[PDB]
Ligand binder design. Structure first.
Ligand SMILES: C=CCN(C)CCCCCCOc1ccc(-c2nsc3cc(Br)ccc23)cc1
Ligand SMILES: C=CCN(C)CCCCCCOc1ccc(-c2nsc3cc(Br)ccc23)cc1
Ligand SMILES: CCCCCCCCOCCOCCOCCOCCO
Ligand SMILES: CCCCCCCCOCCOCCOCCOCCO
Lengths: 619, 619
């Protein structure tokens, strides 16, 4: 039955593979990337009229009937996203009258306008002079003086926020303004009666930071700030030391863009770092068929390659299939052998992890490292001592990265501080990188492949962690993927691999929860709204990936031969396209719960393949 | 008569011009560049068999009958240069038996072998493990802590030594060893009876530094050096901040090579600065027609372009000659607008100088700046406000750069400390950058073109400087060009331009000195030996450039219609080639008096043209 569905899915993956041997699907997010890119170009005085065009097309193409833009497809109109898109389009050259602008503008106003937007949106507008710099939370370069062990030192922030903070402190120190030509100034963002419904800091704001901010805005007013040049230079140097190979910073949009502006501020456009940083941008860009251009929030070659391999293997292809071997070889050249920012908490730990992007040595993450190492462990490569060696370094690093509670974060160890989550500036997404169920799960299944089990103390501490984190209804939160189906799917698949007994209560209680949210059409789905409203947990239009996930949990928990299980497999078999792939107009990936979602282009092909390979395995 | 000679020279220069509008002749030095490059490649594990070949041919081609290598052509065998060339060749794959090796080896031994070589030579050999690291003068990264105003702080060293010192402190801090394969180890450099005739520090070594060094080598022995990681990172950061546009450091061979090794030491080969640093090298390389490859100690596009323009103008071509305008345009895009290391002594001075290389913004030099600004002053470009403006910035910068004694240095102000010239490490060439007669002269003639004169206090302070620096026999030392003919030529040409009266005593006393050293064949010449033995002052085989220089002094001093003058003009008219150029198998450029000489490939064509244009001018 499904066999053909599977052989067709395989043939498709293999065709999607690149020459070098890796897989790489585009990462989808929202228009703030392109919108900011446009403003970035304006700031750097590097506007390509041709690019603007492809961008206007993209922006419009993404706008909805109501004239708004959301974070995920089929999501509520988002104010911030729409404001930035609005400003972007007006700059590119669109009359504030035209249908699109008008509809959007009304929505912006019906919300309290500019004043109801996140800090970043006001800060970007601040940069082009459409908003007072003094109404923007302040982050001083002096932050660079806080030692390793001090509240709010840059190492208490998550890897992603850290770099952004540093780059920003330089910018907010100079508070520069790059005026927009008159034709694009957007005062009409203030023209509203609705009261500003301002979003506060993540975990609530102590009157302390509130005061401290005001203090900092005052200190900014002075005519002489002692030791500030030093603080700046200490930040510029922090930046220069970490610039990634592709010229980015952390391989993510934010710090990259800010670091570039910061360098512009410091009159270093003639410097290598800037040139390389500016040039690197193109690699993240994407030409869309309908004539548009989009910029990726980040790139996922390694991650894609890793999963693709695991999929194709669990699906059939021999451990030495020349096509997989090509990938295995590629993955080895990716391993990172130098110290990163994690070393600040594990100085005696030898490097051996992998990153998400192509070249980003200072930020390997536990999630990738585990998937890659695990993937390798399922291949038969020529240089068997290199494969055997890589795995060990990777394995040991993961082990050494395990946090206190027994789980694993993504980039750092015990990056569980809470202080940063309260400062004014941080009102968007996560700011710290504490252990998560999904990452911890992947780590467990990775070890599991090697044979390790519940006897080893490391695994136990982890399992205890997952047990304590389980949700009342037996589900598990999905930190880096939408959502409860993603996490529950991971956890169960893992626990089954580390020896745990699937017949246990909590395991069963989870399995049940899965069967219970099966959509009528056979498959499962879970809308991104499940991060905001608990009523959506498990609910949503069925998607190939989310179906595959719930399907893995069922297969892992022994319920392979089940109604729900048979039903799910059917769904994937029917919904499959003639070429072998699958479609998925929804996002199933999570950047920050409730604030930023991603669309992993390969998920729709890889996971269904992996799940089918596991079904065919359980028979 | 000479007219055709001149018209021919013009046609030639115009043909040598590049499309972009600039002139750029290769800079010649000695084989330590290529020899070190080979060792550098070995260290970085990046050996291109094909390149090694082109280098072996080059090394061998440059070797002389006696089997040695000198600093300048027709110069005394140099021990250091030969040792390094010897080690280079043996590495590339040459038997220690072969004719060239044997002859060279014997010379090496008849000198006391390895032990009689400059610090660098022993340090390079130290790097590949053919010499104890503890016998090499030490330079600690801690040197990075000395504040702006403290004996031996990195800003008391000349721009060229500064960068080298910083890069090195990282290297000498780790004292790494990159073993040579056995087939190339060179113990035979010790096999000698002759006593080691060691060269001491430039200005003599106080027993203090001698002890201090011993101290440092001891402190090196310890198991814990507090604040050393910080010292290194302060050095590493200093380098990252200053890397040049082309990927070099200072646009000179030394710091560039060491900075690269330093980065490799810190495991930063995956970093942008390294990559760009490594790739940049090719631009300095040169394919030789006989199948060899040489590496330029530095590049001189700006310098060449500037003089070429001044030559072609003083020779005839209209100020708006489309071909010159192309150059003028190019020269404007070269002006540097950011702060460099000079700003540490002139923080309130606005940037507006030019560099020697293509892209090297942190190190504009006074010499180039003056020639360029002046060259521009003689042109009629389309954007007349840009030209008018640039000159202004440049003019002002030069002025603001003038040192205490009234003269100008090359890169810094009052970089006249003496302490650095005594430490053990510095036993090769200049270590500081004090004012010089030649630079000061060029500056004067620069202003002169603008109409300024002896009335303005600036000019006076300078002239007084020159007056006090004049030599007993009425000659002026040549700091950046071989030698007394170069300086005297500059000085007089200048003084004549700033209004001074040529009929004065010291002026005449100089002019005479010129006529008195005119070789029988009609032209003038001055061997590089004139830096070592005062007997050679003004003496040496006649060259087109050196003739043009003495010829300029004479034309400036009113002695245009003179026997010596007529005679000289004749020489240039005869020695001229059919194509229009001139040959010059000798070096007429100075890197460091007595230690490093350069061959400015364009001098032979440009100066003769300039001198002839000035003769035809005085009639
Ligand atoms: C399935 C999980 C596998 N892991 C291994 C993925 C690694 C992390 C996510 C990949 C990179 O994506 C990001 C893009 C942007 C950000 C960001 N930082 S700060 C920030 C601010 C705003 Br506003 C919007 C976005 C960001 C973070 C991750
Ligand atoms: C004609 C004068 C115009 N001026 C405007 C020229 C600017 C100075 C010379 C151009 C660059 O040439 C150099 C090459 C190498 C060095 C060097 N530094 S440290 C060093 C050590 C050793 Br050993 C050998 C060479 C060096 C310096 C200058
Ligand atoms: C200059 C010191 C070299 C020794 C490096 C060990 C330092 C321990 O790493 C601490 C973690 O900080 C992150 C570093 O990686 C970023 C680039 O810094 C490069 C030079 O060390
Ligand atoms: C980050 C401080 C920016 C203010 C610059 C003025 C500093 C004075 O210059 C001192 C001279 O040091 C050389 C600097 O130029 C090299 C690169 O540093 C870049 C950012 O300043």
């Amino acid at each position: 039955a499904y066999a053909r569905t599977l052989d067709r899915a395989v043939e498709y993956l293999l065709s999607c593979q690149k020459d070098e041997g890796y897989w790489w699907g585009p990462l989808l997010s929202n228009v703030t990337m392109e919108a900011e890119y446009v403003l970035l170009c304006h700031i750097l005085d590097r506007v390509d009229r041709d690019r603007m065009e492809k961008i206007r097309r993209y922006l419009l193409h993404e706008q909805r009937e109501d004239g708004t833009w959301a974070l995920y497809p089929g999501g509520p109109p988002d104010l911030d996203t729409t404001i930035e898109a609005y400003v972007a389009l007006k700059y590119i050259g669109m009359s504030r009258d035209e249908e699109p602008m008008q509809k959007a503008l009304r929505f912006i106003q019906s919300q309290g306008g500019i004043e109801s937007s996140r800090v970043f949106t006001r800060m970007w507008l601040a940069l082009v002079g459409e908003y007072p710099w003094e109404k923007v939370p302040m982050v001083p370069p002096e932050i660079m003086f806080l030692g390793k062990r001090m509240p709010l030192n840059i190492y208490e922030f998550g890897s992603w926020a850290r770099a952004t903070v540093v780059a920003l402190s330089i910018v907010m120190s100079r508070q520069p303004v790059f005026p927009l030509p008159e034709r694009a100034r957007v005062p009409e963002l203030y023209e509203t009666d609705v009261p500003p419904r301002r979003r506060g800091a993540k975990g609530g704001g102590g009157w302390i930071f509130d005061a401290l901010d005001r203090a900092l805005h005052g200190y900014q007013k002075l005519s002489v700030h002692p030791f500030r040049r030093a603080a700046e230079i200490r930040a510029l140097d922090w930046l220069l030391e970490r610039q990634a190979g592709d010229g980015s910073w952390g391989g993510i949009q934010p710090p990259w863009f800010y670091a570039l502006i910061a360098l512009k501020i410091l009159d270093m456009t003639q410097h290598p770092a800037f040139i390389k940083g500016w040039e690197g941008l193109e690699l993240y860009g994407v030409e869309l068929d309908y004539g548009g251009w989009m910029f990726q929030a980040s790139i996922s070659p390694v991650w894609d390659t890793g999963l693709a391999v695991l999929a194709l293997r669990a699906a059939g292809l021999p451990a030495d299939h020349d096509r997989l071997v090509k990938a295995g070889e590629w993955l080895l050249d990716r391993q990172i052998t130098v110290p990163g920012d994690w070393a600040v908490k594990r100085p005696n730990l030898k490097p051996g992890g992998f990153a998400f992007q192509f070249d980003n040595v200072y930020y390997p993450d536990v999630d990738d490292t585990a998937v890659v190492v695990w993937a390798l462990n399922t291949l038969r490569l020529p240089d068997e001592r290199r494969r055997r060696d890589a795995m060990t370094k990777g394995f040991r690093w993961i082990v050494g990265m395990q946090s206190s509670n027994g789980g694993w974060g993504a980039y750092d160890v015990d990056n569980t501080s809470d202080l940063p989550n309260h400062i004014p500036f941080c009102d968007f997404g996560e700011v710290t990188d504490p252990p998560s169920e999904d990452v911890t799960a992947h780590v467990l299944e990775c070890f599991g492949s090697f044979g390790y089990d519940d006897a080893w103390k490391v695994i136990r501490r982890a399992v205890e962690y997952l047990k304590r984190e389980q949700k009342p209804d037996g589900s598990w939160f999905g930190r880096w993927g939408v959502n409860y189906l993603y996490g529950t799917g991971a956890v169960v698949s893992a626990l089954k691999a580390v020896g745990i007994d699937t017949r246990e209560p909590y395991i069963q209680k989870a399995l049940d929860w899965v069967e219970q949210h099966q959509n009528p059409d056979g498959g499962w789905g879970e809308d991104c709204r499940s991060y905001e409203d608990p009523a959506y947990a498990g609910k949503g239009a069925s998607t190939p990936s989310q179906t595959a996930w719930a399907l893995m949990a069922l297969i892992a928990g022994g319920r392979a031969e089940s109604e729900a299980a048979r039903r799910g497999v059917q769904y994937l078999v029917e919904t499959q396209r003639p070429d072998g792939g699958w479609d998925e107009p929804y996002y199933t990936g999570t950047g920050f719960p409730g604030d930023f979602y991603l669309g992993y282009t390969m998920y729709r092909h890889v996971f269904p393949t992996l799940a089918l390979g596991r079904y065919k395995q359980a028979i």
